[PDB]
Amino acid sequence: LKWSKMNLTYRIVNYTPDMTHSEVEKAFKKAFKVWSDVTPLNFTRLHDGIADIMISFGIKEHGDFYPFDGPSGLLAHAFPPGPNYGGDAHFDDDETWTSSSKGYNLFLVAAHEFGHSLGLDHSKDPGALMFPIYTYTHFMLPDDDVQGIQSLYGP
């Protein structure tokens, strides 16, 4: 699945206890720039109303009947392109979100989630951003991910 428009909006609906608003905003902006740097996609942030990509933090059952599982295990999830929940990204706040090597790095997980938000599935390449298993190694988007997103949207 794929967006049929190149100009997308996002809204940060709420914030984790774990980080300042400024650090959350910085991580998400950097994560969208990963994808906008290698496609014609553009992302603009909204402070109210409906955005294409609605982003929120929650625990257990948080509104969509795909519940999170407490600390560890599932980290986050995102819906493929489409209306309503399509594109939206949810983060499990029973994890500890950071801008460091500790806990789970919000930038890295967000960049992966936004890959799903844009229509990418998982990669079998263990070095890819879209590999299903999280590890923590200046960020450079791996070549499998560049190839994958450009197949949908071009350079």
Binding site: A78, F79, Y85, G86, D121
Partner: peptide, 5 residues
């Protein structure tokens, strides 16, 4: 549609 982790 089931979201992906």
């Amino acid at each position: 549609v089931t979201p992906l982790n």
